[PDB]
Design an enzyme around this catalytic site. Structure first.
Site, PDB file in Angstrom:
ATOM      1  N   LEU A  87      -7.838   1.421  -9.080  1.00 56.47           N
ATOM      2  CA  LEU A  87      -7.009   2.242  -8.209  1.00 56.47           C
ATOM      3  C   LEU A  87      -5.602   2.225  -8.804  1.00 56.47           C
ATOM      4  CD1 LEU A  87      -8.077   0.784  -4.779  1.00 56.47           C
ATOM      5  CD2 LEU A  87      -8.097   3.206  -5.350  1.00 56.47           C
ATOM      6  N   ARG A 146      -9.073  -7.993   8.221  1.00 53.89           N
ATOM      7  CA  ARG A 146      -9.061  -6.577   7.968  1.00 53.89           C
ATOM      8  C   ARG A 146      -9.167  -6.502   6.447  1.00 53.89           C
ATOM      9  NH1 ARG A 146      -6.575  -2.014   5.216  1.00 53.89           N
ATOM     10  NH2 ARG A 146      -4.840  -3.407   4.940  1.00 53.89           N
ATOM     11  N   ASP A 194      -9.114  -4.565   3.007  1.00 54.76           N
ATOM     12  CA  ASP A 194      -8.533  -3.447   2.306  1.00 54.76           C
ATOM     13  C   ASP A 194      -9.533  -2.808   1.344  1.00 54.76           C
ATOM     14  OD1 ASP A 194      -6.075  -2.037   1.181  1.00 54.76           O
ATOM     15  OD2 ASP A 194      -6.777  -3.114  -0.604  1.00 54.76           O
ATOM     16  N   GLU A 200     -10.688  -0.615   6.157  1.00 57.70           N
ATOM     17  CA  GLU A 200     -10.017   0.666   6.122  1.00 57.70           C
ATOM     18  C   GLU A 200     -10.732   1.613   5.172  1.00 57.70           C
ATOM     19  OE1 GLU A 200      -5.741   0.790   5.339  1.00 57.70           O
ATOM     20  OE2 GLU A 200      -5.781   2.928   5.489  1.00 57.70           O
ATOM     21  N   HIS A 204       0.250   1.947   8.625  1.00 59.32           N
ATOM     22  CA  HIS A 204       0.904   1.968   7.328  1.00 59.32           C
ATOM     23  C   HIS A 204       0.499   3.058   6.349  1.00 59.32           C
ATOM     24  CE1 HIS A 204      -2.883   0.098   6.944  1.00 59.32           C
ATOM     25  NE2 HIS A 204      -2.706   0.130   5.649  1.00 59.32           N
ATOM     26  N   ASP A 205      -0.576   3.788   6.616  1.00 62.89           N
ATOM     27  CA  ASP A 205      -1.030   4.816   5.712  1.00 62.89           C
ATOM     28  C   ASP A 205      -0.803   6.237   6.195  1.00 62.89           C
ATOM     29  OD1 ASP A 205      -1.700   3.440   3.390  1.00 62.89           O
ATOM     30  OD2 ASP A 205      -3.693   3.001   3.893  1.00 62.89           O
ATOM     31  N   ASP A 252       4.661   6.208   3.116  1.00 63.10           N
ATOM     32  CA  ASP A 252       5.066   5.032   2.367  1.00 63.10           C
ATOM     33  C   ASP A 252       6.174   5.302   1.343  1.00 63.10           C
ATOM     34  OD1 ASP A 252       2.989   3.208  -0.090  1.00 63.10           O
ATOM     35  OD2 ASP A 252       4.748   2.500   0.895  1.00 63.10           O
TER      36      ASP A 252
HETATM   37  O1  LIG Z   1      -6.437   3.472  -1.445  1.00 63.33           O
HETATM   38  C1  LIG Z   1      -6.822   2.598  -0.351  1.00 63.33           C
HETATM   39  C2  LIG Z   1      -6.085   1.235  -0.568  1.00 63.33           C
HETATM   40  N1  LIG Z   1      -6.066   1.062  -2.021  1.00 63.33           N
HETATM   41  C3  LIG Z   1      -5.297  -0.085  -2.548  1.00 63.33           C
HETATM   42  C4  LIG Z   1      -3.864  -0.143  -1.963  1.00 63.33           C
HETATM   43  O2  LIG Z   1      -3.218  -1.350  -2.361  1.00 63.33           O
HETATM   44  C5  LIG Z   1      -3.951  -0.108  -0.448  1.00 63.33           C
HETATM   45  O3  LIG Z   1      -2.678  -0.245   0.192  1.00 63.33           O
HETATM   46  C6  LIG Z   1      -4.611   1.216   0.021  1.00 63.33           C
HETATM   47  O4  LIG Z   1      -4.539   1.231   1.472  1.00 63.33           O
END
Ligand SMILES: OC[C@H]1NC[C@H](O)[C@@H](O)[C@@H]1O
Ligand SMILES: OC[C@H]1NC[C@H](O)[C@@H](O)[C@@H]1O
Ligand SMILES: OC[C@H]1NC[C@H](O)[C@@H](O)[C@@H]1O
Ligand SMILES: OC[C@H]1NC[C@H](O)[C@@H](O)[C@@H]1O
Ligand SMILES: [Ca+2]
Ligand SMILES: [Ca+2]
Ligand SMILES: [Ca+2]
Ligand SMILES: [Ca+2]
Lengths: 686, 686
Positions: free
Chosen positions: A194, A227, A229, A257, A327-328, A371
């Site tokens: 990513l 949670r 990530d 998430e 946060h997203d 962000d």
């Molecule tokens: O892209 C989804 C997830 N990828 C990795 C990122 O660090 C995180 O903040 C994000 O929510």
């Protein structure tokens, strides 16, 4: 202990979560603040450390800011040690303030605090009946460049101070080296990096065992929820063995998430919620709630259809975490937006099904784009805002009214701008009425509810212009006008005589694990728990009381079972389905098949003789397998959670529409490892 | 045989019943017409015989009138011999044209036909796939005066030609001699006479056994269903032993009439539907449909609350017989009132849950007030009225679409004048949209349905101004205008892959009786039927196919059981609850307890050791007992259906809210008769 107890780490529907970016909430200890280029005490460069820490959250639990709002769980930034580098991205400096760039999953991030500061936060939260959820991000370590080993800390991973390895010269393949994802396929997003984050390789036995040992350590320190990530970006078979590790050791509420955009409904997302062993942040709820209450791109019929549809599509809807921002996404409250919109969306979320999460600072009407602008330091700790009072009045109803925590959702009145819905659990009822139109009153005629006769006072005390509801015989309310922007909540609670199950946690575990069944009407005397038609009584029921049962999973064959309770008098509950009994402990095995050529729309799957592989049923076979990144067509591969330490039998098959083509020859056999991973590499048998 | 077969005498949710007053439909044989004063060939005097008979009904099945309408069941006037008297009520002459004044329950009424005509009617109906339901009126014989034995035929009862007795000089006590009811209480309306009808005494063993032999005789002649008259006016414990006689012999669909006024919701009415073994004419549905579509004394929100409340209060809503008018109501269509009201209400009934009944002549838009004006001879046999065409297009859907025959009801769009609801069963869907406003079109924006993406023709082909529905992604329909008076029906069927139970009949019987489980997805291979946790397989499943299973009730203890089907692959169905297994054959015993003085709101109850007596559970005790008419307080009495031919143990208790006060002593024992009735007269024991 009762269902509403802080010691109930398994189910959170009676809780309200307050999501904290630790760095942006309160700096209770200035001595632990990063120095120099990594720190900005004014918090105007939102990519730097502003100083917030675990002592600041302890202080805000202590002085009554959090507990005064009715909060019963906090969700904080990932606690593990992060990289110390200040990364310059196109001019702007950037630090790990958010906790997402790990370097050691067994140590704390010292900007947040020490191990003793974490223990003190757990103990203070528990003493004040607050559960603590931690972020955990097992997908990656930190920004890395294998071509430039001097960039940042080159994604290095340490195990309690001991260097396991970096991204450059990764001779052990702790990491994936396939380039960066373009997000084109789910496969592409799982095995490629990513952005520049060094992607961990969970097929490496050292990485698998390390991350499983690390999560157990945080569970041993008393955390109550996790949670995860980037669940869309890790192999789903490895995440199922990760959830089995948690559930068979010390089961705690875990959710992930998986982002969904506006009007995106995804099959894979719903499958993941239903079969991974974890639930999800409910983006389907959040996006429709913002369309109806914030952007006005949909009306009350869209809200109704989402509540009605999600109730069916999520196998356990009471486990999904709802929110209106986080946060997203851009903060819900905007510059030119009416504050009543935020207040209504919060009242809707707090009274709806699922586990509500409130993003820190919502109660202080914070606004901001994406962000990093949605993560400003919160500007005030005023306990007198209307939003604060709205949460303070409604959030305790999750503990006191089982209909709010567990009930069904029934639309009782609706038009484009008004919805009145009822939550019902046994004889407990809550009715919520919301008029989102800010200039037109709504005439309500013909409202029928399950409320017994009485004059019900608005739980919000008229602060969002609610009114008293007069209910006569047969639950019919006398007619009333709901004010422009009006929101009112009415409720009735009683003791149930029928057993009713509202939630069960964990949902997937091997024989011998104690699960927690919560609801009402179980009675004081030990009765019977049914897993399918198998009865569990006596010593296997570890604890029995009216709102909670703890019982050991019987030694039944792996598969999916319905759970049912009968109280001591033989009266039986509703069925709570989709419980997965595992065959035993899990390990992830990579299955690789060569020479499996296929037609258009034909894919390769795997099945075999344990429940984990679908028990020879083509409809439940594992796949479609992958065939682009780690291995390329006609070689297909897939990472699958399977029972540890045993000989399984399996076969591959091709499926296209209703046609199943099996491999010929004898069934394949493989003896799985007791821990770690393994790879099976075979060739298609015609 | 499949669920939709004319041989399925147990369940009628795939049928559409056509209710015929035999004398007012078709005179097919003038030679059997009553003569002289008893007959009016012109049917201008609606209280005399007009000539209609069973041969006329055979002629309307054979010439295509009834089969062309899509009717699959006929419900006709009581077939038994009635008194011959022409009674003069205050100048007006009156005869038994309606079949309600029985004198011999074992012979036919000659004006309708011979036994041979009745057998020919059964065979002609069955040959044309029409089921036959008969009235049975075991509450009384005929108008009688004990003071004046010359009035009418003094309510005389014959047993196949042999006089059993009359109302004057009733030394055998075949009848009740307590005066006429004033309808002040249930108890009063049960043991006193209805108007001047000689009330039969079901506690007399001759009457009891005679009425049960009489019904068995008509089941042997091939009838498919029984509509019982005046169920509110016979002891509920005698009616439950009567139903058990039917169900343990040759189970057929039985339903009764208990009148409910507008806005009347009665707990006893729902308790009787749920506990007697028979279902009911759904007056709750009928009264609200008339208020909304005829009278305009309520709007679509009240129709929504009726549908949603009745779902819950009726334990088996699919067995309730719905209607918009009948012999005990003014005709729905008014003299040159808007025919579209009638047409929408028939469409509403034909697509809603339960078993729809259409009163004869509704398709000819007959109007008229209360008795006898709602029973005129039907004036035409035209097959081209819009109403005839509406029945013809919608009635077959109950056989072809299981969502209409068995599905849930779900409101998906509503405002004061428009309702759009969806019926759903597996993935079969039907969506009905009704705009009762005859001047205003309605813009439907926001409709979401379970229909697949595509365009759907209105099944009514536009005759009630309906239109084509275009459904996109997510079941969201494109915006459309629903015309003033518009009604449209859109549907989707597809085969069920997994077992779903839509209906079970009978719902109450002893071990060894065969029951009929109807639904979809059972598959062709025998699977398992569960009564609670008791699996029934192999030779005990008498028949198994995809829409219908017949299985013998296992030898389980008497009690209420959940039924569940698992197909041969092991996929399990929804649970169909509230099935009562009886301990054995049933007799009605009168229990009498003297010197049971109670306080304010304290009542006497009976409980005992068989399931029929509540199994010693005070919350399941029989009562409150009666204490006004047959015996007077502090003597209490009740007629209770109990297992025949065995020793039962029992006690009486008094209850005032939650305080239960028992009799002292050892439990009482009684060995019940194998046949007939018995009385236990006993003294309270402190
Ligand atoms: O892209 C989804 C997830 N990828 C990795 C990122 O660090 C995180 O903040 C994000 O929510
Ligand atoms: O015949 C190949 C394949 N067919 C179907 C059988 O269920 C499975 O066990 C076998 O491996
Ligand atoms: O209770 C209503 C009902 N009473 C008994 C009568 O015979 C019948 O004619 C009428 O329809
Ligand atoms: O409690 C009083 C009564 N209840 C039920 C018991 O079975 C019976 O034996 C007893 O006498
Ligand atoms: Ca600090
Ligand atoms: Ca990854
Ligand atoms: Ca005739
Ligand atoms: Ca009577």
């Amino acid at each position: 202990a009762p269902d509403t107890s802080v010691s109930n780490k398994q189910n959170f529907s009676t809780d309200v979560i307050y999501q904290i970016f630790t760095d942006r909430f309160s700096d209770g200890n200035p001595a632990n603040n990063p120095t120099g280029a990594a720190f900005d005490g004014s918090c105007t460069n939102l990519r730097l450390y502003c100083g917030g820490d675990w002592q600041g959250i302890i202080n805000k639990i202590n002085d009554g800011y959090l507990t005064g709002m009715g909060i019963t769980a906090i969700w904080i930034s990932q606690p593990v040690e992060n990289i110390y580098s200040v990364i310059n991205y196109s001019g702007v400096n950037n630090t790990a303030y958010h906790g997402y760039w790990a370097r050691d999953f067994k140590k704390t991030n010292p900007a947040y605090g020490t191990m003793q500061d974490f223990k003190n936060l757990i103990d203070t939260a528990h003493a004040h009946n607050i559960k603590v959820i931690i972020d955990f991000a097992p997908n990656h370590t930190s920004p890395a460049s294998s071509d430039d080993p001097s960039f940042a800390e080159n994604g290095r991973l340490y195990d309690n101070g001991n260097l396991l390895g970096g991204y450059t010269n990764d001779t052990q393949n702790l990491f994936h080296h396939y380039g960066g994802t373009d997000f084109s396929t789910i496969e592409n997003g799982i095995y490629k990096n990513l952005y520049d984050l060094a992607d961990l390789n969970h097929n490496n036995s050292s990485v698998d065992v390390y991350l499983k040992d690390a999560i157990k350590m945080w569970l041993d320190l008393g955390v109550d929820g996790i949670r995860v990530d980037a669940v869309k970006h890790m192999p789903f078979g490895w995440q199922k063995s990760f959830m089995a590790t948690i559930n068979n050791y010390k089961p705690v509420f875990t959710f992930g998430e998986w982002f969904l955009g506006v009007n995106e409904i995804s099959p894979e997302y719903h499958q993941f919620a239903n079969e991974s062993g974890m639930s999800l942040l409910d983006f389907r709820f959040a996006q429709k709630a913002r369309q109806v209450f914030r952007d006005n791109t949909d009306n009350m019929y869209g809200l109704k259809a989402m509540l009605e549809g999600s109730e069916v599509d999520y196998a356990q809807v009471n486990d999904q975490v709802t929110f209106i921002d986080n946060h997203d996404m851009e903060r819900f409250h905007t510059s030119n937006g009416d504050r009543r919109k935020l207040e209504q969306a919060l009242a809707f979320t707090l009274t709806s099904r699922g586990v509500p999460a409130i993003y820190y600072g919502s109660e202080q009407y914070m606004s901001g784009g994406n962000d990093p602008d949605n993560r400003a330091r919160l500007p005030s700790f005023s306990t007198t805002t209307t939003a604060y009072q709205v949460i303070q009045k409604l959030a305790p109803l999750r503990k006191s009214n089982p209909a709010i925590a567990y009930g069904s959702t029934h639309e009782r009145w609706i038009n484009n701008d008004v919805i009145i819905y009822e939550r019902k659990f046994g004889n407990n009822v809550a009715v919520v009425a919301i008029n989102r139109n800010m200039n037109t009153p709504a005439s309500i005629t013909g409202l029928v509810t399950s409320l017994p006769r009485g004059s019900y006072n608005d739980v919000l005390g008229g602060i969002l212009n609610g009114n008293t509801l007069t209910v006569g015989a047969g639950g019919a309310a006398s007619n009333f006008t709901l004010a422009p922007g009006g929101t009112a909540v009415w409720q009735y609670t009683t003791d149930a005589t029928t057993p009713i199950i509202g939630n069960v946690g964990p949902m997937m575990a091997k024989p011998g694990v104690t699960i927690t069944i919560d609801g009402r009407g179980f009675g004081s005397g030990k009765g019977t728990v049914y897993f399918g038609t198998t009865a569990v009584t006596g010593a296997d029921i570890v604890a029995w009381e009216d709102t909670q049962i703890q019982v050991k999973i019987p030694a039944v064959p792996g598969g999916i079972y319905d759970i049912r309770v009968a109280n001591a008098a033989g009266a039986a509950s509703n069925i709570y389905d989709n419980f997965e009994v595992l065959t035993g402990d899990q390990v992830t095995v990579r299955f690789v098949i060569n020479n499996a050529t296929t037609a258009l729309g034909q894919n390769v799957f795997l099945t075999g003789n344990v429940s984990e592989l679908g028990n020879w049923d083509p409809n439940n076979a594992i796949g479609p397998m992958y065939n682009q990144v780690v291995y390329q067509y006609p070689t297909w591969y897939y990472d699958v959670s399977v029972p540890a330490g045993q000989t399984i039998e399996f076969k591959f098959l091709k499926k296209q529409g209703s046609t199943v083509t099996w491999e010929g020859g004898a069934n394949r056999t493989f003896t799985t490892p007791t821990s770690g991973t393994a790879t099976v590499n075979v060739n298609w048998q015609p």
